[PDB]
Design an enzyme around this catalytic site. Structure first.
Site, PDB file in Angstrom:
ATOM      1  CG  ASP A 287      61.851  79.535  16.212  1.00 14.60           C
ATOM      2  OD1 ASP A 287      63.117  79.530  16.184  1.00 14.60           O
ATOM      3  OD2 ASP A 287      61.236  79.945  17.219  1.00 14.60           O
TER       4      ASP A 287
ATOM      5  CD  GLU B 147      56.536  84.937  19.487  1.00 11.83           C
ATOM      6  OE1 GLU B 147      56.593  85.491  18.313  1.00 11.83           O
ATOM      7  OE2 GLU B 147      57.540  84.583  20.187  1.00 11.83           O
TER       8      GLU B 147
ATOM      9  CE  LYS C  11      64.050  82.859  17.456  1.00 19.48           C
ATOM     10  NZ  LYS C  11      63.223  81.824  18.104  1.00 19.48           N
TER      11      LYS C  11
ATOM     12  CG  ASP D 146      56.503  81.421  17.412  1.00 16.63           C
ATOM     13  OD1 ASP D 146      56.289  80.200  17.247  1.00 16.63           O
ATOM     14  OD2 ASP D 146      57.590  81.836  17.907  1.00 16.63           O
TER      15      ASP D 146
ATOM     16  CD  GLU E  24      58.910  87.760  22.453  1.00 20.18           C
ATOM     17  OE1 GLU E  24      59.206  86.582  22.806  1.00 20.18           O
ATOM     18  OE2 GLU E  24      58.199  88.065  21.398  1.00 20.18           O
TER      19      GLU E  24
ATOM     20  CG  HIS F 182      62.877  89.204  19.289  1.00 17.69           C
ATOM     21  ND1 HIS F 182      62.092  89.919  20.158  1.00 17.69           N
ATOM     22  CD2 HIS F 182      62.059  88.290  18.735  1.00 17.69           C
ATOM     23  CE1 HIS F 182      60.879  89.428  20.171  1.00 17.69           C
ATOM     24  NE2 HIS F 182      60.836  88.427  19.330  1.00 17.69           N
TER      25      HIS F 182
ATOM     26  CG  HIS G  16      58.587  81.293  29.036  1.00 10.91           C
ATOM     27  ND1 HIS G  16      58.696  80.526  27.888  1.00 10.91           N
ATOM     28  CD2 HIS G  16      59.537  80.814  29.882  1.00 10.91           C
ATOM     29  CE1 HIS G  16      59.665  79.650  28.025  1.00 10.91           C
ATOM     30  NE2 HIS G  16      60.197  79.801  29.231  1.00 10.91           N
TER      31      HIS G  16
ATOM     32  CD  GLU H 198      58.370  81.557  14.859  1.00 14.87           C
ATOM     33  OE1 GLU H 198      58.004  82.772  14.605  1.00 14.87           O
ATOM     34  OE2 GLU H 198      59.098  81.246  15.870  1.00 14.87           O
TER      35      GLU H 198
ATOM     36  CE  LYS I  17      59.566  85.452  16.117  1.00 15.41           C
ATOM     37  NZ  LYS I  17      58.614  84.412  16.597  1.00 15.41           N
TER      38      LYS I  17
ATOM     39  CB  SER J  52      60.066  78.680  23.813  1.00 17.13           C
ATOM     40  OG  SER J  52      60.032  79.785  22.912  1.00 17.13           O
TER      41      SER J  52
HETATM   42  O1  LIG Z   1      60.367  80.963  19.907  1.00 13.89           O
HETATM   43  C1  LIG Z   1      60.551  82.161  20.119  1.00 13.89           C
HETATM   44  C2  LIG Z   1      60.758  82.691  21.391  1.00 13.89           C
HETATM   45  P1  LIG Z   1      62.481  82.387  21.906  1.00 13.89           P
HETATM   46  O2  LIG Z   1      62.822  83.005  23.207  1.00 13.89           O
HETATM   47  O3  LIG Z   1      63.396  82.922  20.683  1.00 13.89           O
HETATM   48  O4  LIG Z   1      62.653  80.777  21.897  1.00 13.89           O
HETATM   49  C3  LIG Z   1      60.534  84.182  21.228  1.00 13.89           C
HETATM   50  C4  LIG Z   1      60.818  84.411  19.761  1.00 13.89           C
HETATM   51  O5  LIG Z   1      59.881  85.354  19.235  1.00 13.89           O
HETATM   52  N1  LIG Z   1      60.575  83.083  19.157  1.00 13.89           N
HETATM   53  O6  LIG Z   1      60.393  82.830  17.771  1.00 13.89           O
HETATM   54 MG   LIG Z   2      61.335  79.683  21.139  1.00 14.49          MG
HETATM   55 MG   LIG Z   3      59.492  80.950  17.685  1.00 11.69          MG
END
Ligand SMILES: O=C1[C@@H](P(=O)(O)O)C[C@H](O)N1O
Ligand SMILES: [Mg+2]
Ligand SMILES: [Mg+2]
Ligand SMILES: O=C1[C@@H](P(=O)(O)O)C[C@H](O)N1O
Ligand SMILES: [Mg+2]
Ligand SMILES: [Mg+2]
Lengths: 433, 433
Positions: A317, A166, A342, A244, A209, A370, A157, A292, A393, A39
């Site tokens: 994010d 999440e 990230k 999230d 995950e 991750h 997904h 998030e 995370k 995503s």
């Molecule tokens: O938004 C997301 C997805 P992604 O695959 O990184 O986009 C899974 C990760 O925990 N996060 O913050």
């Molecule tokens: Mg994402």
């Molecule tokens: Mg995210």
């Protein structure tokens, strides 16, 4: 300094190609690999894929590998720079690529080399990776983070109707990082038992995950399950909840669709204000301490309005994509108060460290993260300790592309010995410890 | 030679504790971790758990770790033996434990040290691990194995009604090991789409080894699904099917229960002969070239009878538990013609290599294998190459405790360069290469 740089295609945790880089110095072989998101925010630096539909459904990364082996590698070796010079080597790659979004070589090509350089640099300094990263960032007082384990999944997904992406558990009341791992695993196995009993024996296979995606629609019900598992495991005051939402995924025509995996029906859409009210109810009814991507990546007014009216952590994010330009805007508009970090959203170690320092300078939290597509690489475990952010995370306590990072944090805590400090209830602001 | 040994508890790919060992020599740090089975045979060496319900629901391995740190480590250090002396160090541990099934220290304690010693020994020899293993085994030629990917799951730890445990694909017709990975990944991703369309969006989450467990009851329907994915991906000519039935898991009253996950009802049960007849049909209707544990670990007569009436590979797993004693009996009764090699079933590298040689000397194939509970460790990748067995089963191409091994085999292939041979159609009998 650099004897050789050699890149190759490996498979990530979802069975898709990704970049791995070997860097050789007199001190040895230093290896790193690149993760890949599912995503992804629309402002992320470019992940370069081959698009050859006859190989891996177009997901090969031979082109990125070739950019490394043919172009980046001889350039960096020609430069004569020491591998300790992270900023200079990264800047060199950045100018070589010459594009803002790294669309000539690909963010995945540049990051691969950047990570390997950083590991080789640590060895040249004769420092463990996390201490080298701390020095690059100007830090001296390391901390072990609170882990945030994604145990219930919805979103784009997941094969259920749950819209928010999440639901995480955070053992803020643990004694140490090793103890936080134990608490996480015990609640996780408890939750698996609860889901099995209530949703059936076929409802406990895992997502990308390692978390569960049972068939529920109400987000409040996901929070209920998680709280129930926490309480059943006997950790009611020691473990709290993070979310999230990934609201960009169900943003429709300026409104939000909490049933976006059901056949389109615009009358069900709700406003940003209604969504904000729903979150306020979650924070009241459940121990949610962090949210998030509560709103779309472009819906700045709704972010600023919510953040000004809640006392919890609000994490950018897809809003910020680890990008100093977007972060500065978020700082100015007070859109959020934590950065999700990230490294492959921005494409180099140097820039990720700059993004972290920019957040931290402005009183923000930082949570290292991750991607849904991970590898056996454990760089971000040393990264979160070296950046002293207090929170990471990187999956449920299940699947080793996730446990490899958590295990490495347990090794780091062990190595730091009597000097190991755990962020606990100060995961937002560990500098006060 | 050995400066220090330090063991610790980490988490495996299922989120349960397991043993990891750090071993230090002059040339540095050598790290290994131990896997853990889910459907364990009753004759396996003892996996020692703590049983302390105050921690990890009784699944801690602190006792094993303590046996290493308090007892085994100073013993091996005091011995003054070089780390190249695998046999001597392993024998020293065997004597120290003094029990048949390693029930004093635990098989997991002993293997952890045994694996780290083997890695330290390879560096002392200035060899890559697989060459060191090759020398320990008396081999000169190296071969890349055909991978066997478990893509459809049933059995004890699958949440469907399907009784047989694993349905695997083997890219025997791939050009190389790297090409085998691509074939496996493309069929895996094809299969995911097929399962999504027939069983629904909520049916493609993965089990412990990365495979799918849709709600089917007929084992023939599992074989049809796999076949369908192979052809849709366009590889009918190049990919065949292997099975791990794990019949011990549904052995009831001298009979076999193909619905053992439904409430007990002996009218359901079928005899070994009837089961055998079902396998004969599978082998005819589908490209099944290998069946593992077709009958119970104690049902010797059924094994010998079936093996004498087929031409396919018949694999001992729970029958043989990587144990020279049980293998010699299997040899004598011609119960099977292939050994599944699991280092933690017997508990040391020396004994596993002996099991492998005993098998190969008697004309058997050998398939190196993972456990349901794995780690980021990649030892068995070097092991299968060094032992030149020609075949390995280490998961679906999904979850990095699986991909870590497959990725390592791609690196090994690359490193061998022009000298790389892929077992291909000779996976059962590679010594002809
Ligand atoms: O938004 C997301 C997805 P992604 O695959 O990184 O986009 C899974 C990760 O925990 N996060 O913050
Ligand atoms: Mg994402
Ligand atoms: Mg995210
Ligand atoms: O029987 C099994 C299970 P286990 O977890 O090792 O018992 C998974 C492995 O592939 N195999 O042969
Ligand atoms: Mg088994
Ligand atoms: Mg088996």
């Amino acid at each position: 300094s650099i004897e050789k740089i050699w890149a190759r295609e490996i498979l990530d945790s979802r069975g898709n190609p990704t970049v791995e880089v070997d860097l050789y110095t007199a001190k040895g072989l230093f290896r790193a690999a690149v993760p890949s998101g599912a995503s992804t925010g629309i402002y992320e630096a470019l992940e370069l894929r081959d698009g050859d539909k006859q190989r891996y459904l177009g997901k090969g990364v031979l082109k990125a590998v070739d950019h490394i082996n043919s172009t980046i590698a001889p350039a960096l070796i020609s430069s004569g720079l020491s591998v300790v010079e992270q900023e200079k080597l990264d800047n060199l790659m950045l100018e070589l690529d010459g594009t803002e979004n790294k669309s000539k070589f690909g963010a995945n090509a540049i990051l691969g080399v950047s990570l390997a350089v950083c590991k080789a640099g640590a060895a040249e300094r004769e420092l463990p990776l996390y201490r080298h990263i701390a020095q690059l960032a100007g830090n001296s007082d390391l901390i072990l983070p609170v882990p945030a384990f994604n145990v219930i999944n919805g979103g784009s997904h997941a094969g259920n109707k749950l819209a928010m992406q999440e639901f995480m558990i955070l053992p803020v009341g643990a004694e140490s990082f090793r103890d936080a791992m134990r608490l996480g695993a015990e609640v996780y196995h408890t939750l698996k038992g609860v889901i099995k009993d209530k949703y059936g024996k076929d409802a406990t296979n895992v997502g990308d995950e390692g978390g569960f995606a049972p068939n529920i629609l109400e987000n409040s019900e996901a929070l209920e399950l998680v709280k129930e598992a926490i309480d059943k495991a006997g950790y009611t005051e020691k473990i709290v909840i993070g979310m999230d939402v990934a609201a960009s995924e169900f943003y429709r025509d300026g409104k939000y669709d909490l049933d976006f995996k059901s056949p389109t029906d615009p009358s069900r859409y709700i406003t940003g204000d209604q969504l904000g009210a729903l979150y306020q109810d979650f924070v009241r009814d459940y121990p949610v301490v962090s949210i998030e991507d509560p709103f779309d990546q472009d819906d700045w007014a709704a972010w600023s309005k919510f953040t000004a009216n809640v006392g919890i952590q609000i994490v950018g994010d897809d809003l910020t994509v680890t990008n100093p330009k977007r972060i500065e805007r978020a700082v100015e508009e007070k859109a959020c108060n934590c950065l999700l970090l990230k490294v492959n959203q921005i494409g180099s170690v140097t820039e990720a460290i700059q993004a972290c320092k920019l957040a931290q300078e402005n009183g923000w939290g930082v949570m290292v993260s991750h991607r849904s597509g991970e590898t056996e690489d454990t760089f971000i475990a040393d990264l979160v300790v070296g950046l002293c952010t207090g929170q990471i995370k990187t999956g449920a306590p299940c699947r080793s592309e996730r446990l490899a990072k958590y295990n490495q944090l347990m090794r780091i805590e062990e190595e730091l010995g009597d000097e190991a400090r755990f962020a606990g209830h100060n995961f937002r602001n560990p500098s006060v410890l």
